Amino acid sequence: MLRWITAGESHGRALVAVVEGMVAGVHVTSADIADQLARRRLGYGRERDAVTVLSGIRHGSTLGGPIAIEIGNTEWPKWETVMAADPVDPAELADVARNAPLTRPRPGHADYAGMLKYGFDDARPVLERASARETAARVAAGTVARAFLRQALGVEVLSHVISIGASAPYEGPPPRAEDLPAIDASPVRAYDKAAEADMIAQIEAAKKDGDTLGGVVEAVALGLPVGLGSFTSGDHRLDSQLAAAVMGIQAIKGVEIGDGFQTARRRGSRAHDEMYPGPDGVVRSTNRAGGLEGGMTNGQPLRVRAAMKPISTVPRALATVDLATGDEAVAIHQRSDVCAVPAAGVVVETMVALVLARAALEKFGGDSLAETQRNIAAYQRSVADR
Template sequence: MRYLTAGESHGPALLTIVEGLPANLQLDTAAVDRELERRQGGFGRGGRMKIERDRAVFLSGLRFGRTLGSPLAIQIANRDHDNWLAQMATVGTQPEELARVTLPRPGHADLAAALKYNLKDIRDVLERASARETAARVAVGAVARQLLAAFNIRVASQVLAIGEVASVGADPADLVTLTPEVDSSPVRCPDIQAAAAMQALIEEKRAAGDSLGGVFEVVVTGVPAGLGSHVHWDRKLDGRLAAALMSVQAIKGVEVGGGFACARLPGSRVHDEIAYEDGRGYFRRSNRAGGIEGGVTNGEPLVLRAAMKPIPTLTVPLPSVEIDTHRPGRAAVERSDVCAVPAASIVGEAVVAWEVACALREKLGGDSLEEMREHWTAYNSMLTER
């Protein structure tokens, strides 16, 4: 499967084309909208999310809510475009009096991409670099998670840290069941005390014109052993999941299972003993590998963590250099989030759901959901016979 996204942050709409879905998956389009709504939330967001009310409009690939096996085209309107008609017109001539953005923000794509693409108005960069694009990815992930749900594979997440406030978090194995509780926390952290401290810290940094990052965890349950492959670097599922998470705006580190902590421990305290019980088959008494060994799922839940850097746009901006004159100045200020870790955790769920769905499609093949199910049944009975 593959997908592309298009769209500028204040352009008319975000678009995505998803290719390679099986036919006959009954899609709950309201559930796609619910995922978009989850991404819009979280304590620490800026004013933009008050304007938007993201809805997925399906333009192709569906008939009466059922996938046809043809490309799915999804459009999400940018309501804010109405306020940017002159600045973000897709055709016509740029008016002389239109103010350009010429003071690049440290930490954003502003300067690096303006140099690369020879752009004189940094708006040409920031409109696409913006994490508004992740709304399209959440729509794609929402479709992927419905395909996974047809095989009882579930995806969930929680926020583990915002700035220096950290929580041990809920047991990853319980996270799917705990999703309503996690979602009801304004910072998506089920530890009530830590959540309150996180919100207080966000308020403090907002008042100081500063920003915050943090850490979130994504968990996938119900994953059978055997997704991904050990045979080639670009088929290793841990590598693909890490790339997917790292591609999300502002993600600077990814851990699988024990991650960086494993480097400090001896092997006897890292690797998961192998056990076997009749009727249950092979299993592990611990899951420090995070459900992947050798690039292949081992039947335990997938556990991944991502580190998000602080938001680059600061209302008390850092020193920068004006790109027309090379004179020192202060970075441009765009309307911005102070902290978007809760929203990023939803994006994390989406990109992980997509990669796991791709791996499932590769394992099971088939052009229709029925064919996938037949292969699933055959594969599972092969697993239980071993």
């Protein structure tokens, strides 16, 4: 089974992604990874040599074994003592201001619950791993998944921003793959010019007020065959798996498949996607279901929406308690941006790609790309022969 794991602290030496269970023969390079990492940095309101492929790829082709990708920390020299792996003289450490105690947990962040859970008197060990810097390692892994999906299935994954702050949501038609350059060129990764202007204005107002914004993003996967995922149990359903992968992204508080919560307000006669005869099989005129029925891909674009909360580190830090003393306090000062919704969209693409690649390998099997491709072709033919 395809599996992915990330490791690293935000201010540690490096991040590492490991992908296991990918077939041999998938073309992917350090440049591909760097390109996707650059996309994760996109957005209004927020070193390529830092990527090193350590294992599992040779001459731009996957080997079949575990793929380990390292992302170096360019500011490691500042953190090499505070985040040293090995012991440091506590006296030396005591003189380092940067090592000062972090005992005022931020509302909305992992700090408080993680400190209690792990018995830590300091937030440092929690925030270092909880930080969304970890999504960089996710994107490295996702690049391997996305290469596989393209090469094996002709599938493309993209995202666009639906709303930021109080903007009027974009409810027009979703983009296609050919639209991604324009989307990534938008300061807010919008597919609609009116929505773009509205969102930029919301960010400007928040920026002036010293506040932060969340938003809603939609990931779209195009070209999927029918029958990835299964109805046979809750955990094998693709909607279940996608919901896990997307809700587990930092700051995501909501996930929808297709029209989601709006579907719940509709009558059955107007809520589903009717089927009609077509040249090359069944066709539909709507995609309210977002490309999934009974936990399976149904031929239509997959559409997954995610709601991101506004960043919790607000420049003037919110009210909290100093756990050292029990006193009222203002929260620890940390990384804050006005809005990270466009980047959150890119992270959603990655998690969607990983889950789709896993599901594809489950159905089509194979140990090399050519093998998997033969199996895909035979299945497609069998469906066509219906």
